[PDB]
RNA sequence: AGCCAGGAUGUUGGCUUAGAAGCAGCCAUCAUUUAAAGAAAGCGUAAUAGCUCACUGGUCGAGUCGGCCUGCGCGGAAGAU
């Protein structure tokens, strides 16, 4: 159902991460399984409007990156404390 | 009126309130009242907000207070010179970091919880906001 | 010209005061043998051509007294 | 009127109008609702 | 409120009655009391008359089943219909009563 | 959104009802007719009554309603040569 267009984090660290949050993106990472994990920068308002749906925490989520289409499922999320927005997502491979 | 029944010591240093909060996810009920500002709450404020909420839902529903003071404020009396020892205790406070969920409620409609929390938000020294049950 | 439904539960139901406790405690129970005859005799000023129309209408008024429907 | 720092629509027929940079509240039904310095 | 399926549903409820119609009344009802309505509802099934008051712009969806587009374009003003399903007449006569009995509208159809 | 029109019956819903008819109030808040009529949102009532709204039809015809993230503003804001 869900399909997420995404870029690749070329720089990692909190300075680039807070630049990336202030640029109205936010980072996340896919891990689990046999492959080395993959770090993602992606758009904020898109997924912020996705995640209110209850199906977001249940169904299987496809993500387009490099053209490659990856099937994952959501595990945990670093929400910001008081504003209604997000910081970081841990995705788990299938 | 909310007060530790026994403490390890009489007094405590002043301390600081640097950083953010822990108790952030809504974990008991359906609706939550969360701190946005940064400061400290008295037991009188907490009890008055509790009375406002219980007034608005009149009796019915279950209400959680996720906070408890466990910090005194020493106050030297009127017309006492400086020094001569740290003052006596007159009121207890709770440390507030931003994003701390303060109150929690289950068993009512959403609009009623919303208006009850905006009644109790005026009882408080800080800006507070409204949150739902999440994952 | 037609008698009210609130007073008919003092001569054909069993209670002599009013409710007291509408949905806190049941006092008695009402079957359908008491009200079909009264609904049949009261076909002078009603709303509804079918008898089914005012059947549940007359029954549903008495429910706020701590009475049990028996059907 | 009554001049309170925070003004509210009080009924169905209360109304918010800015006049001379000052907020005023007018009711068509009840004269008590009339307010200023919002 | 009013679902699009609800607006479909009123059409699907009325259209088979229109298919099972003999003649009908398209009137004006500019002001009729509840006590002026309930006896007319009684006389409805009491003579076998099936009357409805619809969204007046929402009829031609069900009326468009020719041969029932006959007096189609009579939607101006508030209207209402009364189909008769047995012995045509005895439904239009029921409003030919009130056309001189309630001192109001000339019926449009 | 205006404007034309409706907006009931059982029903004063039970009651400590002095007196309560949605009409301060304690309880649930359910049934007819239809397009709708909350057994009720709120002013009035000695208690009624009378005048609105939540709802529905028509007239008119292109946008309309208030939630969020935000930059900048407004009131709040009165002292003494
Ligand atoms: Mg640094
Ligand atoms: Mg000035
Ligand atoms: Zn007003």
Curated annotation (Swiss-Prot), chain A:
The record ties this protein, via Pfam families, to: Ribosomal_L25p (PF01386)
Tagged with keyword Ribosomal protein: yes
A GO molecular-function descriptor = structural constituent of ribosome
Q: Which CDD domains match?
A: Ribosomal_L25_TL5_CTC
Q: Which GO terms describe its cellular component?
A: cytoplasm; cytosol; cytosolic large ribosomal subunit
Q: Which domain of life is it from?
A: Bacteria
Which keywords label this protein? Ribonucleoprotein, Ribosomal protein, RNA-binding, rRNA-binding
> InterPro entries, alphabetically?
Rbsml_bL25/Gln-tRNA_synth_N, Ribosomal_bL25/Gln-tRNA_synth, Ribosomal_bL25_short, Ribosomal_L25_dom, Ribosomal_uL5_bac-type
Asked if the keyword Iron belongs to this entry, the reply reads: no
* GO BP, sorted A to Z: cytoplasmic translation; negative regulation of translation; response to radiation; ribosomal large subunit assembly; translation
Protein family according to the UniProt entry: Belongs to the bacterial ribosomal protein bL25 family.
Task: Give the HAMAP family listed for this entry.
Answer: Ribosomal_bL25
Complex and partners? Part of the 50S ribosomal subunit; part of the 5S rRNA/L5/L18/L25 subcomplex. Contacts the 5S rRNA.
The protein's role, per its UniProt record: This is one of the proteins that binds to the 5S RNA in the ribosome where it forms part of the central protuberance. Binds to the 5S rRNA independently of L5 and L18. Not required for binding of the 5S rRNA/L5/L18 subcomplex to 23S rRNA.
Q: Would you tell me the protein name for this molecule?
A: Large ribosomal subunit protein bL25
Which species is this record about? Escherichia coli (strain K12)
UniProtKB/Swiss-Prot annotation, chain B:
The organism is Escherichia coli (strain K12)
Q: Which PANTHER family match?
A: 50S/60S RIBOSOMAL PROTEIN L16 (PTHR12220), LARGE RIBOSOMAL SUBUNIT PROTEIN UL16M (PTHR12220:SF13)
Q: How does it assemble?
A: Part of the 50S ribosomal subunit. Cross-links to the A and P site tRNAs. Interacts with assembly factor DarP(YjgA).
Keywords, alphabetical: Hydroxylation, Methylation, Ribonucleoprotein, Ribosomal protein, RNA-binding, rRNA-binding, tRNA-binding
Q: Which HAMAP family match?
A: Ribosomal_uL16
Recorded GO MF terms: rRNA binding; structural constituent of ribosome; tRNA binding
> What is the name attached to this protein's record?
Large ribosomal subunit protein uL16
Task: Report any Pfam family annotated for this entry.
Answer: Ribosomal_L16
Q: What is the taxonomic lineage of the source species?
A: Bacteria, Pseudomonadati, Pseudomonadota, Gammaproteobacteria, Enterobacterales
UniProtKB/Swiss-Prot annotation, chain D:
Gene Ontology terms for molecular function: rRNA binding; structural constituent of ribosome
Q: Which UniProt keywords apply?
A: Ribonucleoprotein, Ribosomal protein, RNA-binding, rRNA-binding
Q: Does the keyword RNA-binding apply?
A: yes
The set of disulfide-linked cysteines is none
Q: Which InterPro entries match?
A: Ribosomal_bL36, Ribosomal_bL36_sp
A GO-annotated cellular component: cytoplasm
Report the superkingdom from the record.
Bacteria
Gene Ontology BP annotations: cytoplasmic translation; translation
Give the matching NCBIfam families.
Answer: rpmJ_bact
Q: How does it assemble?
A: Part of the 50S ribosomal subunit.
Family to which the UniProt record says this protein belongs:
Belongs to the bacterial ribosomal protein bL36 family.
Q: What does this protein do?
A: One of the last ribosomal proteins to be assembled in the 50S subunit, it contacts a number of helices in the 23S rRNA, acting as molecular glue. The simultaneous presence of uL16 and bL36 probably triggers ObgE's GTPase activity and eventual dissociation from the mature 50S ribosomal subunit.
> What protein am I looking at?
Large ribosomal subunit protein bL36A
Q: What is the species listed in this Swiss-Prot or TrEMBL entry?
A: Escherichia coli (strain K12)
Name of encoding gene: rpmJ
Curated annotation (Swiss-Prot), chain E:
Q: Which residues carry this modification: N6-acetyllysine?
A: 36, 104
Q: Name one GO biological process term.
A: translation
Q: Which GO terms describe its molecular function?
A: large ribosomal subunit rRNA binding; ribosome binding; structural constituent of ribosome
Alphabetized, the UniProt keywords read: Acetylation, Repressor, Ribonucleoprotein, Ribosomal protein, RNA-binding, rRNA-binding, Translation regulation
Q: Which GO terms describe its cellular component?
A: cytoplasm; cytosol; cytosolic large ribosomal subunit; large ribosomal subunit
Q: What else is known?
A: Ribosomal protein L8 appears to be an aggregate of ribosomal proteins L7/L12 and L10.
Q: What does this protein do?
A: Forms part of the ribosomal stalk, playing a central role in the interaction of the ribosome with GTP-bound translation factors.
> Self-association or partners: how does it assemble?
Part of the ribosomal stalk of the 50S ribosomal subunit. The N-terminus interacts with L11 and the large rRNA to form the base of the stalk. The C-terminus forms an elongated spine to which 2 L12 dimers bind in a sequential fashion forming a pentameric L10(L12)(L12)2 complex. Two L12 dimers associate with a copy of L10 to form a very strong complex (called L8).
Similarity section: Belongs to the universal ribosomal protein uL10 family.
Per its record, how is this protein called by name?
Large ribosomal subunit protein uL10
The organism named in the record is Escherichia coli (strain K12)
Tell me the stretch of the parent sequence this chain holds. Answer: 2 to 110 of 165
